[PDB]
């Protein structure tokens, strides 16, 4: 029927003066654009069909052509930034926003999807969708007593589009829009569908990727406990965005980090720091490094949860990037920690793996490590135990590596190594 038309047949049908023929040709276009392999997006655009589709969006008396044109434009807008720009230039934004109030659920959903792609293109189109007033009707679609009464796919598409309205930076979304969206986002963050939860955590992670004021906008809504709960979920698509959100939050002030700690987040990190997925381990170690860079009572919270041995483990064996985040965590620990806490750090066996990591080719990890060593040596000086530490470093081959780093081409590297040698290995 409408399977595998040519673009010229589609153009001939859409340019006819017969609404029904236009509907058939539009459906044919939709089917061309929804095939598995290589849809002819550029050919459809070059045929000049976008304005016709946009005009079909407004044909209230023929909802089928509204749906087919909405679907076709959706799939065009799903492509490159140039194709999405083609959809926007046709005036599609206000038309889709108008369709958000359609009495037909599938048409309204299709509009939600299209706006999701357009806004998902980038900060500019995101802000333009917002300027046309999409947030009010979008959120109105979710103003029901119980989200479970909505269709699963409907709710999933709404959540996804909203998450795209929270996505991208330079600039971040307008503050007023984020405040307008955040309550519904909190509501979705408590829904029982895994995809709604994943997309909600992603949206929160977007909103927390920024200055402390944005982080505060999120944290003030009281979502941290829920974020920890989801951090303990079994579905990796949930744990990943939840962990990213937590990390972002702990990049903020010590009080926000403290709200993460009070929610019980640390209790989850024994598993996260041994998670079989590399990215979970890396992001968890990065989060930890942003915790050990905080107050001494917070470092002490890290200690009490038994997470220092897990850091020693990651530093001993893990993907190199995860090991680098571990080195950062150690250097922050030693920078802000007390003498007792640094002593405890050595008692857990940090020295040997820390030394082994000096044979890495990455310059910055060598710098980080040498700073950590400097700090530990400072604690030893404050305890008069520097000799024993020098012996520790010498028995595991660390002294050889430092002495060799004296010949390292980087300035700060061979500076720090020279200082360590002449000050503690004479």
């Amino acid at each position: 029927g409408t399977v595998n038309w040519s673009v010229e047949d589609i153009v001939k049908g859409i340019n006819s003066n017969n609404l029904e023929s236009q509907l058939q040709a539009t459906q044919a276009a939709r089917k061309l654009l929804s095939r598995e392999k290589q849809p002819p997006i550029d050919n459809i655009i070059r045929a000049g069909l976008i304005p016709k589709f946009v005009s079909f969006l407004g044909k209230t008396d023929c909802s089928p052509i509204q749906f087919e044109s909405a679907w076709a434009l959706t799939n065009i807008a799903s492509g490159t930034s140039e194709q999405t720009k083609a959809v926007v230039d046709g005036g599609a934004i206000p038309a889709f926003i108008s369709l958000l109030a359609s009495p037909h659920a599938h048409i309204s959903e299709q509009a939600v999807w299209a706006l999701g792609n357009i806004a998902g293109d980038g900060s500019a189109f995101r802000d333009l969708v917002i300027k046309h007033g999409a947030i009010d009707p979008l959120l109105a679609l979710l103003a029901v007593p119980d989200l479970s009464t909505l269709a699963c796919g409907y709710l999933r598409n709404l959540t996804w589009t909203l998450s795209n309205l929270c996505r991208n930076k330079n600039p971040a979304p307008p503050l007023d829009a984020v405040e307008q969206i955040l309550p519904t986002l909190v509501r979705l963050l408590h829904h029982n569908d895994p995809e709604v939860l994943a997309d909600s955590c992603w949206a929160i992670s977007y909103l927390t990727d920024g200055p402390n004021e944005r982080i505060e906008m999120v944290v003030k809504k009281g979502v941290v406990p829920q974020l920890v709960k989801l951090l303990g979920a079994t579905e990796l698509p949930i744990v990943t965005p939840a962990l990213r959100a937590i990390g972002n939050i702990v990049t903020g002030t010590d009080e926000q980090t403290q709200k993460v700690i009070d929610a019980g987040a640390l209790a989850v990190f024994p598993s996260l720091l041994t998670n079989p997925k590399t990215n979970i381990q890396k992001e968890a170690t990065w989060t930890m490094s942003n915790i050990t860079a905080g107050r001494q009572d917070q470092i002490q919270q890290v200690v009490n949860h038994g997470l220092v041995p897990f850091l020693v483990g990651v530093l001993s064996k893990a993907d190199f990037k995860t090991q680098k985040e571990a080195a950062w965590a150690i250097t922050n620990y030693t920078s802000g920690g007390t003498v007792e806490q640094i002593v405890y750090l050595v008692h857990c066996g940090i020295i040997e793996p820390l030394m082994n990591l000096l044979s890495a080719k990455d310059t910055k990890i060598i710098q980080v490590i040498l700073d950590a060593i400097s700090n530990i040596f400072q604690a030893a000086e404050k305890l008069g135990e520097t000799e024993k530490l020098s012996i520790m470093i010498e028995e595991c081959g660390g002294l050889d590596k430092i002495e060799a780093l004296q010949r390292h081409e980087n300035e700060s590297v061979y500076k720090a190594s020279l200082n360590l040698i002449e000050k503690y290995f004479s």
Partner: peptide, 8 residues
């Protein structure tokens, strides 16, 4: 991960 979805 990509932010756009093609409806197949």
């Amino acid at each position: 991960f990509p932010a756009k979805k093609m409806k197949v």
